[PDB]
């Protein structure tokens, strides 16, 4: 009959259910139980970028840069290190610079010259992009409306928000993510593994942040010594 | 490389399909009873397709629940709950589910786009507010639809589809539903890594599944 | 603490970095390394499709189609060959209809009647995109700034170069790819293995592909004695 496939079809579901809620538990206690030391803070990197939006978004970001180098000496990149890399996730591409990135921070700047769009991601990190230039329209989770950002002002991602991303073409940002940031990295790789192939991307992106790594650890064992 | 392993696997996958071809012809003569219809469906929402698309989907709720109890879930268990899939990034409120058929709200509130997806099983989307444009298989060129009309995805069908900002429809599906549940959560699975809405996708199938099964005791009880 | 998880991932991500750059070296060999023997010319295929430019895309590709048999006869596949398959890769989802492939050549009409947009792949082939109809936007890696590029012109995705595309509806174009084709296949694939479960139109892909190869091994050994 059909109501053994029913039986069958709901026992199957449960294990998934059960798998994947296990999975959520999992990612909430490595999250929440992590290390929470921090050298910036969203505020902060906000202003910064709120300050200059007013600017060419190259032109703000090269001030970005020299100003986030001016009050955190030796968490910031050198010029040898940027790099515009791509970042296919979630369905969408964009861009990135990293400029700082540790176990629990990030920074960067982002944005993209063609229209995109998509998932989000969830995680355990809490992510704010302030706008230069552009247009940013948010989804969020449960509600069947959408809401426009425009430079100055700041989306905040918050920890296990799950929304969907749209950017119109030539949209520029600034972005800071704290949190536990390893568990990002398997939404930020996704798609260059199961859609672009691109292989040469993935070395570049692990490339900058095992160099962003290096560098935190030269700066605490400098200022240790 | 070599083409040899294109030549298997091009001529393994004919063997396959021919296989499954004359398996899937068999069950269409085995075919030979159903809660809904896609005239049905689309009917109550082409009705309520002149007003505000919350409204529509209110009144269509009362509306199930009142020509169909205990097929229908209840508020408590209404959610939204995003879909990625084939590329593009919707939004579902699901309120009937078996393993034959289902029912729910679809949209999306931002410009969207993809696969249809392909599987055993005709779709029906009686469009509520925005526009819905169709690219079907083999041609060149693509159709565009609006509040009103409805959209029939063929068995076996494989189209391209794109939402406009803030595009909702009313959704009927029948045939072999479980098909159709790899091309619903590939993309959760390679893309977004969203584990949450994978749960929460499952979570209210399973629920749907047994408000079905216990209706049927309830009946036959 | 903190600093062994901060070694542990920085072990694992330089693992991931060699890894890559294995796969990039590997591709490279395959591509430098591999067969010369051309069909076509690039500025052949420019000059053709750009010259029918003007007209209905459809007219065009069947003209064409028609100059193409005529100038390389037995390297084209018959009509009864001949079929739009979709393709779905690097988020964007177009549709081809393939007239010549072999391991270093490839010419098929391509475009799309959505809107969409993507990455467009890495791999070891120079392509050529001349359009016939609607827009081509192109944003190159390492620069912040896109392309818009019309009817007429022709974009060179150069070996090794990635990009993002991304085309308006109806936008239809005649490509031409030279390099080592089977690099591609798996980025012509990757969205219909893991987004799309599109199991029909990866029969459909192996299909065409294995077609226009048997063409071109069937016309060299009949010109040959066998
Ligand atoms: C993947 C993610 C996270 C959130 C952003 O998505 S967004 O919609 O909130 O803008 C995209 C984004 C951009 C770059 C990604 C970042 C996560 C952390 C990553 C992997 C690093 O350490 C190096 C590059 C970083
Ligand atoms: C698999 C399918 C079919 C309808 C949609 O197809 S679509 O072309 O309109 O996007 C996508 C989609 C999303 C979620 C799926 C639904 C089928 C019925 C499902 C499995 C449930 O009971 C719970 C969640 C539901
Ligand atoms: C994968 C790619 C390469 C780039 C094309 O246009 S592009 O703008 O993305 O560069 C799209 C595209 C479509 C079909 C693909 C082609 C590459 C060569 C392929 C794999 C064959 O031998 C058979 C089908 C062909």
Redesign the pocket.
């Known amino acids: 009959g059909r109501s053994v496939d029913t039986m069958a079809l709901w026992l199957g579901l449960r294990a998934v259910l059960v798998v994947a809620g296990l999975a959520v538990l999992l990612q909430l206690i490595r999250g929440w139980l992590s290390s929470k030391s921090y050298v910036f803070n969203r505020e902060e990197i906000a202003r910064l970028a709120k300050e200059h939006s007013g600017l060419d978004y190259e032109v703000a970001f090269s001030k970005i840069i020299v100003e986030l180098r001016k009050k955190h000496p030796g968490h910031i990149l050198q010029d040898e290190d940027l790099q515009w890399?791509f970042?296919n996730?979630?369905g969408?591409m964009?861009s990135?610079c990293?400029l700082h990135?540790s176990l629990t921070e990030?920074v960067?700047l982002?944005g993209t010259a063609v229209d995109t769009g998509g998932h989000?991601?969830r995680?355990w990190?809490e992510?704010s992009?302030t706008i230069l230039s552009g247009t940013f329209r948010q989804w969020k989770e449960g509600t069947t409306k959408s809401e426009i950002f425009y430079p100055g002002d700041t989306?905040v991602?918050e920890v296990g928000e799950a929304?969907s991303?749209q950017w119109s073409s030539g949209t520029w940002?600034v972005?800071y993510?704290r949190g536990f940031?390893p568990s990002?990295?398997a939404?930020?790789?996704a798609d260059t593994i199961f859609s672009t192939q691109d292989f040469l991307t993935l070395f570049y992106?692990v490339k900058?942040?095992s160099k962003?790594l290096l560098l935190e650890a030269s700066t605490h064992l400098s200022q240790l010594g």
Do not use: K, Q, R
């Open positions: 890399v970042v996730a979630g969408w964009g990135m990293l990135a990030y960067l982002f989000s991601g995680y990190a992510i992009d989306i991602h929304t991303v940002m972005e993510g940031i990002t990295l939404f930020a790789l992106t900058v942040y962003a």
